[PDB]
Amino acid sequence: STGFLVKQRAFLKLYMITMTEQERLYGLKLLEVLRSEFKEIGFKPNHTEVYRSLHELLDDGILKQIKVKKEGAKLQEVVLYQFKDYEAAKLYKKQLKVELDRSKKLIEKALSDNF
Amino acid sequence: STGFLVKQRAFLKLYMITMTEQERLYGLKLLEVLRSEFKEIGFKPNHTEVYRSLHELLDDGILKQIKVKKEGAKLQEVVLYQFKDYEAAKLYKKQLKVELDRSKKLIEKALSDNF
DNA sequence: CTATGAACATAATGTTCATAG
DNA sequence: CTATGAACATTATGTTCATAG
């Protein structure tokens, strides 16, 4: 790694953690929320990148899955997430904060040097 | 393309254009100047990415090569660059300015929503 | 039809290797 | 040697395919 901008998977993983802190949404739901938030800026993530993020967090041991099966009128069989190790999540958030700041700097320097 | 952050090749191509506007440096020279400018932020591009940028610009028809042989105490078979179509270069700079602003926005939004 | 998640493709990169002269 | 640039490997990311409902 030459140390360029932050990767999308990491950027999304950051958002998966924050959303596990504030809500209980499943994959396609996270994807829908995310697309809506970024529709204006132009970023349109797909479902496989969101799943990759969520699953990477499972492997990192930060999240744990909760299989849910809501029965009745509108059958849903989704997967919800919660923290398995919030401390490791906090640490991931801090690392990502450093990655995001460098990134902001890299873009500022470029805006400054070419325009 | 899901429209995430700006790619490195584009980011470097932007810098090749600006540097063709302000100086006459050859590949390894551009690379040395670039590494020095970004040593602090932590970005360390390599010589093959710089060549890819320069060559992409040749294909886009924005630059043209000038083979230079620096004779004397230390012969050098170097390549210098100049504009072949500065108008197309200006347009590439503008497109990239839009890409860079979106990028800055994407990172700001992320810093704002998770911290 | 939804939702999950795998598979596979392609693109972006990063590391090595080739070569003129 | 040494500045350019081609090859090759590996990542990161976008599209399809497979299952279960």
Short mmCIF file of C-alpha atoms (C1' of nucleotides) in Angstrom, two decimals:
data_model
loop_
_atom_site.label_atom_id
_atom_site.label_comp_id
_atom_site.label_asym_id
_atom_site.label_seq_id
_atom_site.Cartn_x
_atom_site.Cartn_y
_atom_site.Cartn_z
CA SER A 1 0.00 0.00 0.00
CA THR A 2 1.35 3.36 -1.20
CA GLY A 3 -0.90 5.13 1.31
CA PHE A 4 -3.42 6.85 -0.96
CA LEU A 5 -7.11 7.45 -0.14
CA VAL A 6 -9.20 5.33 2.26
CA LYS A 7 -10.72 2.21 0.69
CA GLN A 8 -14.48 1.84 0.27
CA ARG A 9 -14.79 -1.40 2.30
CA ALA A 10 -13.14 0.33 5.31
CA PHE A 11 -15.28 3.44 4.77
CA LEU A 12 -18.42 1.29 4.79
CA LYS A 13 -17.24 -0.78 7.73
CA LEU A 14 -16.98 2.47 9.67
CA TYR A 15 -20.63 3.16 8.84
CA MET A 16 -21.70 -0.38 9.81
CA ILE A 17 -20.26 0.14 13.29
CA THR A 18 -21.87 3.55 13.78
CA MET A 19 -25.21 2.14 12.61
CA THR A 20 -24.90 -0.81 15.01
CA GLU A 21 -24.52 1.84 17.73
CA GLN A 22 -27.68 3.72 16.73
CA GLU A 23 -30.07 1.19 15.22
CA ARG A 24 -31.05 -2.31 14.25
CA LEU A 25 -31.20 -2.58 10.46
CA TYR A 26 -30.51 -5.56 8.23
CA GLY A 27 -28.26 -5.66 5.15
CA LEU A 28 -30.64 -4.42 2.47
CA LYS A 29 -31.90 -1.88 4.98
CA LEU A 30 -28.44 -0.52 5.67
CA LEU A 31 -27.95 -0.40 1.91
CA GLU A 32 -31.17 1.56 1.41
CA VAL A 33 -30.32 4.04 4.19
CA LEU A 34 -26.78 4.46 2.81
CA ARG A 35 -27.89 5.04 -0.77
CA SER A 36 -30.37 7.66 0.36
CA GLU A 37 -27.83 9.51 2.52
CA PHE A 38 -25.35 9.68 -0.37
CA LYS A 39 -27.74 10.02 -3.32
CA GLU A 40 -26.93 13.71 -3.55
CA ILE A 41 -23.14 13.43 -3.46
CA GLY A 42 -23.34 10.67 -6.07
CA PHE A 43 -22.09 7.61 -4.20
CA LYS A 44 -24.29 4.53 -4.79
CA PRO A 45 -22.92 1.45 -2.95
CA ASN A 46 -24.20 -2.03 -3.81
CA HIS A 47 -25.47 -4.88 -1.65
CA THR A 48 -22.44 -7.05 -2.01
CA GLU A 49 -20.09 -4.37 -0.69
CA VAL A 50 -22.37 -3.85 2.34
CA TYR A 51 -22.40 -7.59 3.02
CA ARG A 52 -18.63 -7.74 2.64
CA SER A 53 -18.31 -4.97 5.23
CA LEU A 54 -20.67 -6.63 7.69
CA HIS A 55 -18.95 -10.02 7.23
CA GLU A 56 -15.49 -8.56 7.58
CA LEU A 57 -16.65 -7.13 10.92
CA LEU A 58 -17.85 -10.61 11.87
CA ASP A 59 -14.40 -11.98 11.10
CA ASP A 60 -12.73 -9.11 12.99
CA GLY A 61 -14.88 -10.21 15.93
CA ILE A 62 -16.51 -6.80 16.28
CA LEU A 63 -20.06 -7.84 15.34
CA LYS A 64 -22.15 -10.97 15.84
CA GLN A 65 -25.18 -12.05 13.85
CA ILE A 66 -28.74 -12.30 15.05
CA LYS A 67 -30.89 -14.37 12.69
CA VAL A 68 -34.47 -13.01 12.83
CA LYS A 69 -37.65 -14.56 11.35
CA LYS A 70 -40.67 -12.28 11.56
CA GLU A 71 -43.81 -14.38 10.77
CA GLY A 72 -47.28 -13.17 9.86
CA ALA A 73 -48.59 -10.93 7.06
CA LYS A 74 -45.22 -9.97 5.58
CA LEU A 75 -42.77 -12.80 6.13
CA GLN A 76 -39.23 -11.49 6.59
CA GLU A 77 -36.18 -13.63 7.31
CA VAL A 78 -33.37 -11.09 7.79
CA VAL A 79 -30.12 -10.92 9.76
CA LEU A 80 -29.55 -8.24 12.40
CA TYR A 81 -26.30 -7.24 13.98
CA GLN A 82 -24.96 -6.35 17.38
CA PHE A 83 -21.58 -5.84 19.01
CA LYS A 84 -19.51 -8.82 20.12
CA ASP A 85 -16.58 -6.64 21.13
CA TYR A 86 -17.39 -2.94 21.30
CA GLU A 87 -13.88 -2.14 22.44
CA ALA A 88 -12.41 -3.48 19.21
CA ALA A 89 -15.11 -1.47 17.41
CA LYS A 90 -14.02 1.71 19.15
CA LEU A 91 -10.47 1.02 18.12
CA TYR A 92 -11.55 0.46 14.51
CA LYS A 93 -13.38 3.79 14.62
CA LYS A 94 -10.24 5.54 15.84
CA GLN A 95 -7.99 3.98 13.23
CA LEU A 96 -10.51 4.99 10.57
CA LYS A 97 -10.59 8.54 11.92
CA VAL A 98 -6.87 8.79 11.17
CA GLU A 99 -7.40 7.32 7.72
CA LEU A 100 -10.19 9.78 7.03
CA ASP A 101 -8.15 12.81 8.11
CA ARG A 102 -5.19 11.84 5.93
CA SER A 103 -7.63 11.43 3.10
CA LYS A 104 -9.12 14.88 3.64
CA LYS A 105 -5.56 16.25 3.69
CA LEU A 106 -4.61 14.43 0.46
CA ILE A 107 -7.56 15.95 -1.34
CA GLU A 108 -7.00 19.42 0.10
CA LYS A 109 -3.34 19.40 -0.92
CA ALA A 110 -4.40 18.41 -4.46
CA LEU A 111 -7.09 21.08 -4.65
CA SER A 112 -4.57 23.57 -3.36
CA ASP A 113 -1.71 22.55 -5.70
CA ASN A 114 -3.60 22.32 -9.00
CA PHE A 115 -6.28 25.00 -8.71
CA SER B 1 -18.51 2.65 -10.94
CA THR B 2 -20.47 3.27 -7.71
CA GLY B 3 -19.01 6.77 -7.52
CA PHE B 4 -16.74 6.56 -4.52
CA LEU B 5 -13.47 8.50 -4.05
CA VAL B 6 -11.24 9.70 -6.92
CA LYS B 7 -8.80 7.10 -8.33
CA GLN B 8 -5.07 7.51 -7.93
CA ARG B 9 -4.29 7.43 -11.66
CA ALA B 10 -6.66 10.36 -12.22
CA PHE B 11 -5.28 12.16 -9.18
CA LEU B 12 -1.74 11.78 -10.56
CA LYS B 13 -2.75 12.66 -14.09
CA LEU B 14 -4.06 15.94 -12.70
CA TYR B 15 -0.60 16.57 -11.18
CA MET B 16 1.17 15.65 -14.45
CA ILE B 17 -0.81 18.33 -16.27
CA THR B 18 -0.16 21.01 -13.67
CA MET B 19 3.54 20.09 -13.72
CA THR B 20 3.66 20.30 -17.53
CA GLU B 21 2.29 23.83 -17.03
CA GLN B 22 4.99 24.86 -14.56
CA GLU B 23 8.10 22.87 -15.42
CA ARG B 24 10.04 20.43 -17.50
CA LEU B 25 10.75 17.29 -15.45
CA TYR B 26 11.12 13.71 -16.60
CA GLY B 27 9.41 10.65 -15.09
CA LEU B 28 11.74 9.82 -12.22
CA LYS B 29 11.99 13.54 -11.54
CA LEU B 30 8.22 13.96 -11.32
CA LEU B 31 8.21 10.92 -9.03
CA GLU B 32 10.89 12.44 -6.79
CA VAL B 33 9.10 15.82 -6.58
CA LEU B 34 5.80 14.03 -5.84
CA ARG B 35 7.19 11.81 -3.12
CA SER B 36 8.76 14.81 -1.41
CA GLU B 37 5.59 16.90 -1.52
CA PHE B 38 3.54 14.09 0.04
CA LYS B 39 6.16 12.54 2.34
CA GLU B 40 4.52 14.18 5.32
CA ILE B 41 0.94 13.17 4.57
CA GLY B 42 2.17 9.61 3.98
CA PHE B 43 1.43 9.07 0.28
CA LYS B 44 4.36 7.44 -1.55
CA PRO B 45 3.56 6.84 -5.26
CA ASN B 46 5.77 4.57 -7.38
CA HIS B 47 7.41 5.03 -10.75
CA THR B 48 5.04 2.75 -12.64
CA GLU B 49 1.95 4.67 -11.57
CA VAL B 50 3.62 7.96 -12.67
CA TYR B 51 4.47 6.41 -16.06
CA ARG B 52 0.93 5.10 -16.44
CA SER B 53 -0.37 8.62 -15.79
CA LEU B 54 1.99 10.22 -18.29
CA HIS B 55 1.21 7.54 -20.90
CA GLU B 56 -2.52 7.79 -20.37
CA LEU B 57 -2.19 11.49 -21.09
CA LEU B 58 -0.32 10.64 -24.30
CA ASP B 59 -3.21 8.41 -25.32
CA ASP B 60 -5.76 11.08 -24.38
CA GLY B 61 -3.79 13.35 -26.73
CA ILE B 62 -3.12 15.95 -24.06
CA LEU B 63 0.67 15.49 -23.89
CA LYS B 64 3.38 14.64 -26.41
CA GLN B 65 6.83 13.22 -25.75
CA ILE B 66 10.16 14.90 -26.29
CA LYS B 67 13.03 12.41 -26.23
CA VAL B 68 16.05 14.17 -24.74
CA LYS B 69 19.62 12.89 -24.61
CA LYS B 70 21.61 14.70 -21.92
CA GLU B 71 25.21 14.21 -23.04
CA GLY B 72 28.40 14.79 -21.09
CA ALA B 73 29.69 13.67 -17.68
CA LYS B 74 26.67 11.39 -17.17
CA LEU B 75 24.67 10.51 -20.30
CA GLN B 76 20.90 10.37 -19.90
CA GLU B 77 18.24 9.01 -22.22
CA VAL B 78 15.34 10.94 -20.70
CA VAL B 79 11.81 11.86 -21.78
CA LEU B 80 10.27 15.30 -21.30
CA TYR B 81 6.70 16.27 -21.82
CA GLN B 82 4.76 19.15 -23.32
CA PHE B 83 1.17 19.86 -24.28
CA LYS B 84 -0.22 18.57 -27.56
CA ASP B 85 -3.70 19.89 -26.80
CA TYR B 86 -3.84 22.27 -23.85
CA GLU B 87 -7.57 22.76 -24.30
CA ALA B 88 -8.24 19.08 -23.64
CA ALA B 89 -5.88 19.47 -20.66
CA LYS B 90 -7.95 22.33 -19.27
CA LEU B 91 -11.06 20.24 -19.64
CA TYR B 92 -9.43 17.31 -17.83
CA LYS B 93 -8.47 19.71 -15.01
CA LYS B 94 -12.07 20.89 -14.71
CA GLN B 95 -13.53 17.41 -14.69
CA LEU B 96 -11.02 16.46 -11.99
CA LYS B 97 -11.97 19.51 -9.96
CA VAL B 98 -15.49 18.15 -9.77
CA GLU B 99 -14.18 14.71 -8.82
CA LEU B 100 -12.01 16.23 -6.13
CA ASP B 101 -14.86 18.26 -4.60
CA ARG B 102 -17.16 15.25 -4.43
CA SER B 103 -14.36 13.37 -2.77
CA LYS B 104 -13.83 16.09 -0.19
CA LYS B 105 -17.59 16.00 0.43
CA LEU B 106 -17.66 12.21 0.80
CA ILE B 107 -14.93 12.37 3.43
CA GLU B 108 -16.51 15.31 5.24
CA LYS B 109 -19.87 13.58 5.38
CA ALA B 110 -18.17 10.50 6.84
CA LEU B 111 -16.20 12.48 9.44
CA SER B 112 -19.40 14.27 10.37
CA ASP B 113 -21.64 11.16 10.62
CA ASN B 114 -19.31 8.89 12.62
CA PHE B 115 -17.39 11.26 14.84
"C1'" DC C 1 -41.30 -11.14 -5.39
"C1'" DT C 2 -37.31 -10.52 -0.85
"C1'" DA C 3 -32.98 -11.16 1.35
"C1'" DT C 4 -28.48 -13.39 1.99
"C1'" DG C 5 -24.41 -14.58 0.41
"C1'" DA C 6 -21.67 -17.00 -2.83
"C1'" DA C 7 -19.30 -16.85 -7.25
"C1'" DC C 8 -17.09 -14.70 -10.82
"C1'" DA C 9 -15.64 -10.75 -13.60
"C1'" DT C 10 -12.96 -6.67 -14.06
"C1'" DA C 11 -10.69 -2.97 -12.70
"C1'" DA C 12 -7.10 -0.65 -9.77
"C1'" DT C 13 -3.10 -1.12 -8.13
"C1'" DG C 14 1.46 -2.74 -6.47
"C1'" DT C 15 5.93 -5.61 -7.33
"C1'" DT C 16 8.87 -7.36 -10.26
"C1'" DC C 17 11.25 -7.85 -14.73
"C1'" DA C 18 13.04 -6.25 -19.42
"C1'" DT C 19 15.81 -3.19 -22.02
"C1'" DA C 20 18.16 0.56 -24.63
"C1'" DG C 21 22.49 2.48 -24.99
"C1'" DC D 1 24.40 1.57 -14.97
"C1'" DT D 2 19.81 3.89 -15.16
"C1'" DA D 3 15.41 6.07 -16.82
"C1'" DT D 4 11.51 4.04 -19.23
"C1'" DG D 5 8.31 1.21 -19.54
"C1'" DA D 6 6.46 -3.91 -19.85
"C1'" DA D 7 4.97 -8.10 -17.19
"C1'" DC D 8 2.87 -10.24 -13.68
"C1'" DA D 9 0.56 -10.71 -8.98
"C1'" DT D 10 -2.64 -9.18 -5.94
"C1'" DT D 11 -6.33 -6.00 -4.29
"C1'" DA D 12 -10.38 -3.79 -4.33
"C1'" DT D 13 -14.53 -3.38 -6.30
"C1'" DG D 14 -18.76 -4.32 -9.59
"C1'" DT D 15 -21.78 -8.00 -11.75
"C1'" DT D 16 -23.91 -12.69 -11.77
"C1'" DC D 17 -25.33 -16.73 -9.95
"C1'" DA D 18 -27.25 -19.84 -6.14
"C1'" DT D 19 -30.30 -20.58 -2.17
"C1'" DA D 20 -34.06 -19.96 0.93
"C1'" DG D 21 -37.87 -17.91 1.74
#
